[PDB]
Amino acid sequence: APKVIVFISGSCLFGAISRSLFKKLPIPYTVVLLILGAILGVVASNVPLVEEHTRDVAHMDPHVLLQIFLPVLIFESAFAMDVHTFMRSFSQVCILALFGLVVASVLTAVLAMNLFNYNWNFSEAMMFGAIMSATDPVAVVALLKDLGASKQLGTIIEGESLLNDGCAIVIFNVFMKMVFFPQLTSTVGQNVLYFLQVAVAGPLWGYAVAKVTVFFLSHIFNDALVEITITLAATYLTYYIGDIWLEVSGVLAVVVLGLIVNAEKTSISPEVEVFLHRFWEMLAYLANTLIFMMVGVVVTQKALVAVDKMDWFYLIILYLAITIIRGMVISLFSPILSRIGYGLTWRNAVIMTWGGLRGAVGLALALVVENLAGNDVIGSKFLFHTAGIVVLTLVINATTIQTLLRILGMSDISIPKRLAMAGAVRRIHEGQNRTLNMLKSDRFLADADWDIATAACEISDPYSSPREFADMMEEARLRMLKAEKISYWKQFEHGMLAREALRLLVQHAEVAADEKDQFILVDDLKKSWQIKGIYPWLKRKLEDLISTKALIPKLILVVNGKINNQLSLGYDVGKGYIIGEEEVGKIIDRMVDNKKILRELKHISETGRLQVVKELGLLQREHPGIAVSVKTRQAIRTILNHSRETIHELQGAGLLDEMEAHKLELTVEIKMKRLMNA
Amino acid sequence: APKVIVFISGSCLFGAISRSLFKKLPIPYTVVLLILGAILGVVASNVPLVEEHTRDVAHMDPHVLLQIFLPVLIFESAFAMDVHTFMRSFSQVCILALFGLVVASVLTAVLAMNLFNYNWNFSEAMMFGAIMSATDPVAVVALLKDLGASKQLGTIIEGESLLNDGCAIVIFNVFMKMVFFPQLTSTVGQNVLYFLQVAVAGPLWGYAVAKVTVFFLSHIFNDALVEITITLAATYLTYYIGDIWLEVSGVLAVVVLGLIVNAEKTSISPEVEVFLHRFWEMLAYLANTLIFMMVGVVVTQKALVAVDKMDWFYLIILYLAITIIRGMVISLFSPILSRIGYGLTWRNAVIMTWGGLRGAVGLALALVVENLAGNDVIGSKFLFHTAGIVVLTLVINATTIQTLLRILGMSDISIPKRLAMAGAVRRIHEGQNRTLNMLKSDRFLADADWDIATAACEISDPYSSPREFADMMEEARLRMLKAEKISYWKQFEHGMLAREALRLLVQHAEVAADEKDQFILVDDLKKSWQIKGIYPWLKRKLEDLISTKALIPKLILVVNGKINNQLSLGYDVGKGYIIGEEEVGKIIDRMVDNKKILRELKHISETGRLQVVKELGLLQREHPGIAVSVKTRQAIRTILNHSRETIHELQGAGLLDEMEAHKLELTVEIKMKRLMNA
């Protein structure tokens, strides 16, 4: 009889109860799970029958704990984030995560050595700093997401969470092998070799397995189970092979694998995409629930017996000091981040300072130190301080982050977004009235009383002079920008443009939304039509190389394919821009009040129109075959989407049965996936 | 380091390879998994490093093998079934599964004792027959749904498979405790009490946990991970508590739990249902892959050293005998099923004899016999014979089942189905012709080569006188039934008809299509009206009872709610018939060639309409609040579906963003879930 399935299933049930019963209370479910784990710990100490069930998950081996629960958490943090906004701000988030984690770790280490009375050397103190500097802010990311703007703040916090967790487990493994398995003694050159091995072979092994698995997923059609199975087995094989068979940092490998698989979303079928997002979220929730329950049980059983009043005072001063250290790190890196084109405002800086909530990664590394220490008190005090900072950060920072967003004035709903939603909900009310009027006149449902119906289906609002000429200009700017975004979504809705091209189009739209007095420019788009880079230089060198020798033309084919795919996306974004300008120029002529600013806005729009058609004419001149190819790809998308609409219409008229409709749907879906991998 | 992870992920990747490479070939992927497991077994027998990774999975404990891999297989078999068509024909699958399994087990036991040279008692031979007679034909069900008609035959075989697996593990567990753990010496009364304990408290404990789980699922809103977690934890907790903490037959508990959760699809949110179906299919696929790879490794490491040519001859004779035994069982129960309202023909009898493929359940029971036996020869012989029966049934029967379908003439395509699908594909062809014309007239794609576009967007068809007065009467019956189906599907997709109402209506369409002369009569609709049964008798007892005293109104609420659900189903099916009859009265008067035949159809249609109106009036006078309750639920459904379509219109028009449309979609889906309980 397995003793682990009762604990795993009971943990799932208790996390379900904690999510259900505290979803309106401001504290998260994780602090409730830690409390329930503590109660389970004292009842395990009292009653031996509960001890026999909690023993085999309380005494989890550290290696199996890492190798099971780190890949799922790290892969869900990689998969869940938008990789496009992550790479659009990769430099700032990379320098922030890497340099901020190493300086926050070294400052927490020197604080631990100078202030804690427990005589720790620099290796154990750096282990402590690596644990305390690993952050998992899912809650701050979600709350910044639902409160409208500062979306780039949410992407920045999520990306620095992912990279911070990765390099924190890297430096944790380095100092753990320094201090707990101290048998290795080596020269300077072997240390350079080991650092090079981890720091370079991590992303390289992740890239290798990611390219292999994306090539495998691109060719698999009409079986979803193989796709989910391939992602799961690829993740666990990447981490296990990298950590054990090699000495490669497997954490960075699963980070890179997750980011690459998230980037090539087109290789996976979309129903499997929706499944994979919810599947890795479920595995995330399972891992967090189990890790928090394990932390509670072992922090009651083996860590609280060495607790002193000086230890509690050290916990309070450690919370204050680690918050101050993270804030100061953001403060010193703020000028260097201001050198980057997206500078941190002081509001976003204090949000990132407060938004660091310690999580299951730090708790798991504390559990590893605790189980590997054994009789030594260092593991117990490690576990106590990590669990205390997790509890304190969850309680204080998660209950005060919404209040701080109100205090900063970042949480206010923008007034035009309020008005558009008010018009939408009034139109929903109007449609409800129309359906009530048509539904009163039926030969059956006329007996149905409309009092309870109107009481049920009501959607309330969740929200509830040259200077004046300049304000009018800013209003016209906002109206033209929102009309352009509306046109881009309309171009998406008919299948005119690709999703990947529409992402770049709305990204240029959001860039123009960031600038106050700058309209949608032409040079920023022109840089996207520009083919210049390292790749055309290598193309010229390969054209010189025309005049492993059999493997060279495969490489020139790969380089040429990358070039023509990039300029195909350029042609698509060009077509989108001119179509959007044409639709806006049709639309906006009837609704601008002032003729002078109407002439001004049409002047800048017409100059942009002439410039984009000039650039597209030059691009079609440069290489006509890939222009013909992107026209054919647009043709295939439009025909197959209208055929999908046709089979849905024939199902709706009922003339075709549902199972043969699914057969035709799978035929057109197989054809669409064949188009997406050309 | 966990060595289970490399074998689990390697088996997952091998199953991915075997499915992707062997979809076109007629042999299943499972025989390729068995052969690759054998190759890995002999490699591990030579090379010690491969043994170091396969030892912890080949020498798995049998109890943990059952407690992990049986709940997922049994729950996926239960959830994958159609509960309506299973319970509509529950008597035949129940009698066939129960009596056929005990008869096949007794006959295979006496066959093992009489044939095999090694001395087995009746208990071990009964264990052998229990392993042999458990069947898992997912291939036959998939092909029979794929090959058009005999949907009812596929539901019969699926239900027989599920109940066969459940009762086979029940008889296997009681004889396993008889042989390998014969510590108990029991009285006749204790034996009667224990038989009552398994065969009664299995489904009862499953029903209790299923009602609690359904009630908890019906109240969790806005969150999906809690629902998926609740289903997974409920399954594993139900099996673990029933098998270990009680002596309850826990396989039937998982059977009843899966059948009830499959019945209450309305309690789960609609996206979670699609996720849960694919999730449990994935888990059963991983379980099948691991079970087959494990049985390959252990049959190469342990069973093949104890084989003989006499054993191979015994295996061939055993395969022929198990096929003959299944034929004799279903042939002797054929008159009893002829007394049941749906009877098996000789074609369906031979497709059910040949279609039984032995699989993962039997292989798991072979694995636990092999592990429980130890050094004795009985476990090795068990493993060899079960592996041989599985590989022979796969290789022979799963490859010959399609040509048996062709020979029996059930694989052919129906002529109205073929004509309707040809009309569907010509509608697709003319629609893509008109979109090619609209795609040729645009100044942007004006240079697009339409030849490759046309050549890539082609969807092929996958199938590819008074006597004459009687013949046109028959074809007019077919056309009228087709138009009734057309109106019923139009009522469903307009949002006015319930899904189970459409299932009953197409059941009525098939009943009227069974005999060509008879129309859709009113008597089945009367049986839908006539609520009278044990529950209205209980309602009369409640009327006696109103004249635990606080719990009594809760009981009358429960019985009244059951009656209200039955009234909702009856009102839905009758409203569907009268609306479809009105629509078909609008329709029929054009395509009928003979005026007297037209009036002949119209008279019986009008009398059916009048009868349904009279019965609806009787129901309206019978119960005051229930008719307006069902009418209000239809009103809420119509206005909420129109609100959903309005929010999709606003999102497509771009006046509402994706995040806000997600918010309002969440609001209206929460409102629909609140409508699900009233």
UniProtKB/Swiss-Prot annotation, chains A, B:
It is a multi-pass membrane protein. GO terms for biological process: potassium ion transmembrane transport; regulation of intracellular pH; single fertilization; sodium ion import across plasma membrane. It is found in: Cell projection, Cilium, Flagellum membrane. The chain crosses the membrane at residues 4-23, 29-46, 63-79, 90-115, 122-147, 151-176, 188-219, 224-246, 250-263, 271-304, 310-339, 346-373, 378-408. Residues 24-28, 80-89, 148-150, 220-223, 264-270, 340-345, 409-547 are cytoplasmic. A motif (Essential for sodium:proton exchange) lies at residues 164-165. Residues 90-177, 310-408 are annotated as: Transport core domain. Residues 469-514, 594-653 are annotated as: Interacts with the S4 segment of voltage sensor domain. Residues 548-591 are annotated as: S4 segment of voltage sensor domain. Residues 47-62, 116-121, 177-187, 247-249, 305-309, 374-377 are extracellular. Optimum pH is 6.5. GO terms for molecular function: cAMP binding; cGMP binding; potassium:proton antiporter activity; protein homodimerization activity; sodium:proton antiporter activity. Its main location: membrane. Keywords: Antiport, Cell membrane, Cell projection, Cilium, Fertilization, Flagellum, Ion transport, Membrane, Signal, Sodium, Sodium transport, Transmembrane, Transmembrane helix, Transport. Homodimer; the dimerization is stabilized in the presence of phosphatidic acids. Electroneutral sodium:proton antiporter that regulates intracellular pH of sperm along with capacitation and fertility. Activated in response to egg-derived chemoattractants, couples membrane voltage to sodium:proton exchange and transduces membrane hyperpolarization to cytoplasmic alkalization to cAMP signaling and ultimately to sperm motility. Belongs to the monovalent cation:proton antiporter 1 (CPA1) transporter (TC 2.A.36) family. This is Sperm-specific sodium:proton exchanger. It comes from Strongylocentrotus purpuratus. The lineage of its organism: Eukaryota, Metazoa, Echinodermata, Eleutherozoa, Echinozoa. The chain holds residues 74 to 944 of 1325 of the full protein.
